[PDB]
Design a protein around this ligand. Structure first.
Ligand SMILES: O=c1cc(O)n([C@@H]2O[C@H](COP(=O)(O)O)[C@@H](O)[C@H]2O)c(=O)[nH]1
Ligand SMILES: O=c1cc(O)n([C@@H]2O[C@H](COP(=O)(O)O)[C@@H](O)[C@H]2O)c(=O)[nH]1
Lengths: 257, 257
């Protein structure tokens, strides 16, 4: 039997970051993660401010941001606190442990100083998680493992997926869930976030495949939808965000009771 | 029957970037790629200048560089031309096509404006290559696909590896080879670069596993060794570079005739 996000937030094994996330989801009635896939800091900040009330999470690709500075991240954190959402840097760490720990803590981006969550590919094996955790645990951060991908020809299937789940179970002090197309783990302490989501059928020219919030949350058992162009490419991004929020929320409520 | 690097450089299907690489290798008698895994721009530049004559390639993690600017990359290019080596940004693109193309061209790093080669994970499926190629082909750049990893518990094995090779064959206009632990493709137009290389047996604390140049080039059929700490952590990095160059070169010559 399924538990609400409010109840999952209180589970004995829950990670502090997941708990915070689960409580604001319940509070705000949102399971929408905005993929803020933009290249200007002013658009990112105007989107985070305007859409902040509608989202549980803001997902960034900081290496696209033409005018990144740490001060932009300071501003984004202010918005994140004001409106109550997490910040998720979609960096997809996918190197050896020794390398990823420097990528996570250092360089120009100082990802770990502002990102509540990051993600990693499990291909390098479990050293990728061990490496990130040496920076991440002291900073009280969490990590998502990419168990499945939305894109055409994805190799993240079968035993690869089983292996991402195992890696997650075995690093539960730092790993809080998955990027996947569906529920991959039966343990309610793990979050499932699903990208490749649009209201209408379709894809793009570069291998992206879309499914609807009702399919993803309702039929496939995921918890959160990640949506980029479905919102960002709309004229009214607030209204688009609201239409995604309400679809994912109701899909959730319907799966629950 | 094996061909020299000079002869491979002239093969009908050879990529222009591979050709340039193969010719300077032969010219300089080096198949060593330095992994310049440092956080200061001045150390990177002093290493590239001092070690430039000993290497065919300089591999960077620009997102570790505490004081990155594009001007540092201008300086590195000057050294690369002066001493004749390629620059390889080890970014491990591992997202959907639409995302990777922005990561490759834009943001603060403008990777494609200075990097002769980049690499990518094949997990997202072939859209990761299609996405990079839309930036990379106009800029006359090449890409390496990660077919195998050196680290403990790596999932890049079996059919995953077979799939990286297929992806490579089918994008030969942009993909010039592989990061692997061994020869994975029988086609001499593809380069094999192998990391996880040290003179002495061992590893690190975060899942890295080492093999020697003779094992890697000589027994396993690779073309180029990538070496980080084996050189960078030595007192005399020039002498260390020379000891790696001469091991990899002779291993090559011995496999040849
Ligand atoms: O399997 C995956 C994993 C991802 O992170 N993503 C990311 O999620 C977002 C999807 O964006 P969009 O809704 O514009 O297609 C992109 O930022 C992409 O990098 C994905 O599309 N598929
Ligand atoms: O399978 C792989 C693929 C890599 O790119 N690398 C990279 O190669 C270098 C190995 O460095 P070192 O020689 O210090 O262990 C690192 O920069 C690492 O990110 C690797 O070690 N193993």
């Amino acid at each position: 039997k399924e538990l609400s996000f409010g109840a999952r937030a209180e589970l004995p094994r829950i990670h502090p970051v997941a708990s915070k996330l689960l409580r604001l989801m319940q509070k705000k009635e949102t399971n929408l993660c905005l993929s803020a896939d933009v290249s200007l800091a002013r658009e990112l900040l105007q989107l985070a401010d305007a859409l902040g009330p509608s989202i549980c999470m803001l997902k960034t690709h900081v290496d696209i941001l033409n005018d990144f500075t740490l001060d932009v991240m300071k501003e984004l954190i202010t918005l994140a606190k004001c409106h109550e959402f997490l910040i998720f840097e979609d960096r997809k760490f996918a190197d050896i442990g020794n390398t990823v720990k420097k990528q996570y803590e250092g360089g120009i981006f100082k990802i770990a100083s502002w990102a509540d969550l990051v993600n990693a590919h499990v291909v390098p094996g479990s050293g990728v998680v061990k490496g990130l955790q040496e920076v991440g645990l002291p900073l009280h951060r969490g990590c998502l493992l990419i168990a499945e991908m939305s894109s055409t020809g994805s190799l993240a299937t079968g035993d690869y997926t089983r292996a991402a789940v195992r890696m997650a179970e075995e690093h539960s002090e730092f790993v809080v869930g998955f990027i996947s197309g569906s529920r991959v783990s039966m343990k309610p302490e793990f979050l499932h976030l699903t990208p490749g989501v649009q209201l209408e059928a379709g894809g793009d020219n570069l291998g992206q495949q879309y499914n609807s919030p009702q399919e993803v949350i309702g039929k496939r058992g995921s918890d959160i939808i990640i949506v980029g162009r479905g919102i960002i490419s709309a004229a009214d991004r607030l209204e688009a965000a609201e239409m995604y929020r309400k679809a994912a929320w109701e899909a959730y409520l319907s799966r629950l009771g």
